[PDB]
Design a protein around this ligand. Structure first.
Ligand code: HEM
Length: 108
């Protein structure tokens, strides 16, 4: 597996608005919806967003969302975590994936 290329936060923001925002808010204290609020998610344990009802798979995943883990997971969520109720096919293109992860890193 080759490394992701370098990301861009602005390209990543646009991709977040277009793809993650269908189910995810990004602001601190932003609301839960289809999916949990994602503020502060990078390098944090999975399944901890207050008020969100996770599947047992995500609730007990135990994974820590490092950029490297987000790389593999966001490429194909269901393959990485069978049982996830995150119904997203993934970000297949490495550059787009890198950009989204760079943006997530800015979510303080
Ligand atoms: C670029 C797009 C997306 C990104 C970066 C993203 C990111 C994430 C991350 C990091 C988690 C784990 C959160 C945690 O463990 O606290 C998650 C969970 C989740 N996401 Fe997404 N997501 C994206 C798109 C979507 C879409 C399109 C949907 C719905 C159609 C969705 C719905 C969900 C749901 C329901 C969960 C909880 C899953 C479970 O409990 O098993 N996400 N997402």
């Amino acid at each position: 597996r080759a490394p992701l290329p370098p990301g861009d936060v602005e390209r990543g923001e646009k991709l977040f608005k277009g793809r993650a925002a269908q189910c995810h808010t990004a602001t601190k204290g932003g609301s839960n919806g289809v999916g949990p609020n994602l503020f502060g998610i990078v390098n944090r344990p999975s399944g901890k967003v207050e008020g969100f009802t996770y599947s047992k798979a995500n609730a007990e995943s135990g994974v820590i969302w490092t950029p490297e883990v987000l790389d593999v997971y966001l490429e194909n969520p269901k393959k990485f975590m069978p049982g996830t109720k995150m119904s997203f096919a993934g970000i297949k293109k490495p550059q787009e994936r890198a950009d989204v992860i760079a943006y997530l890193e800015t979510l303080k």
